[PDB]
Amino acid sequence: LSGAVTALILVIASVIIALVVVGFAFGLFGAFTGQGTVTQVGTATLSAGTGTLTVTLKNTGAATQVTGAIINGNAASVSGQVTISAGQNTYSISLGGISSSTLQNLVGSTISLTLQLSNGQTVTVSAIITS
Template sequence: MLLRRKAKKGLSGAVTALILVIASVIIALVVVGFAFGLFGAFGGTPTVTQVGTGYIYVSKGYAVITLKSSGNVQILSATISGTSYSAGTSSINVTTLTAGINVVSIGFSTSALSSLQTGSTYTISIALSDGSTVQVSVIAQ
């Protein structure tokens, strides 16, 4: 009586090893990418901070501030804290902050700003499209 051998089905050892090596390399690249922030789109909401000193020009009716952003986000409005003085997007020259340094000019009514004291420091609250608010300091000139 002759015995027949069943044919082996499946992947060879070499093919399996190759697949595991490729998968390991891909996983390592993804981990390194996240560790070094290469996948910024998946990094959550951008961080916005003030750079340097901001100024509010009382007689001219506008403030100039420099903001650093880690990604794209829109400015919705700006309000001088402790007052009712606010500015909407039509009064802001840069409404979309991009990654990097952004110089922003915010227009206010000159009559509203006339009550501000020259040389004093004020805080402007900037509302962003991601729901956060950034507090920036400005010196009245």
């Protein structure tokens, strides 16, 4: 009974250390290439009714704007306030191009977007879906 709790604390912590090391190694690409690395902070609530995505991306480097988004393997087209200035900020990106049927069907779950930067590497956004 005692050995099943120390076997879960270690799993929970190992999920975290590996992710921290992975993030540190991800950052080394932007640190050496000379371009800032954009990563999201917190969670995002993509709206099925409007298509607006409310992210909180933070970047440490140049000011680069996104060009496209990938939803469930289907390409999209971004719009709205897309500049991604330096420092943490809030952006109301309105993606469009995919049929709204998937958006209204998939209400409640947390899908994983892939916003495509102009400069290079993309940023993976895990966004919940609201009504």
